[PDB]
Each structure stands twice: as structure tokens, then as C-alpha cells.
Amino acid sequence: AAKDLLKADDIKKALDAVKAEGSFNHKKFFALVGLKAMSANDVKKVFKAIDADASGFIEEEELKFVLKSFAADGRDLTDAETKAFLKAADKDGDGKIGIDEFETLVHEA
Ligand SMILES: [Ca+2]
Ligand SMILES: [Ca+2]
């Protein structure tokens, strides 16, 4: 979904910016990849891409592999990057990310 939804050149730019281990910031990533200005309806389509097992939530293991939803060659996130992303996104503290939490995170910038 993500690569159909989003500009190829945006994706390359976003992935380039977070190449170095430790450099992933969700706010910067969302802005560069082009998710920031997208409608809730369209952000939902990206969410479903990241929700690999179709559970309805992005749980921690899926967050670690978030970059592979944008490029198959996307690196894993580090433990710290994963924890930082999870803490920012998981608004209710239940350990995983629901759609409405994801929507809010994308648009809170
Ligand atoms: Ca899931
Ligand atoms: Ca949650």
C-alpha cells in the first residue's frame, strides 16, 4: 500500500534521512515520506500496510520492521528507535498502536 499511496521520490528521501542507525525520528520520517498532509482516510491505508498480521494494531514487532513497508531493503529499527516510536505513538499505554493513535501521531505535528 505505502508505495502506491506515496511518492517514490518522497520515500527515497525519507529512507535516506534515516539510513544511519539511531537516526529514525517518527516526526521527521512522516514529514519527509509525505504522510503529514494526508487525510485520515489515506493514513488508514498506510496503517493497514504496517499492520502485517491484520490484528488491527501495530504491535512492537511490527514497529521494528516499519521501514520494510516503504522499501523491502529498509533496515530494522534499533531497540531505542522502536521504544521511542512506541512511546510516542501508544497514547493509551496498552503496548500497541491502534488506528486512532496512529492518525493522531501523524497529525500532531
Ligand atoms: Ca498487527
Ligand atoms: Ca495503544
Domains of the chain: 1-109 (1.10.238.10)
d(CA 24, CA 29): 7
Annotated binding site for Ca(2+): 51, 53, 55, 57, 59, 62, 90, 92, 94, 96, 101
User: What spacing in Å lies between the alpha carbon of 104 and ligand 1's midpoint?
Assistant: 18
Say whether 96 sits in a helix, a strand or coil.
strand
Ranges of H-type helices in 1-109: 2-5, 8-17, 26-33, 40-50, 60-64, 79-89, 99-107
The ligand whose atoms approach the alpha carbon of 93 most closely is 2
This entry's atomic model was obtained through: X-ray
- Ligand index nearest the alpha carbon of residue 100: 2
Quote the CA–CA distance of 101 and 18 in Å, as a whole number.
23
Do 3 and 12 contact (CB within 8 A), yes or no?
A: no
Ligand nearest to the CA of 64: 1
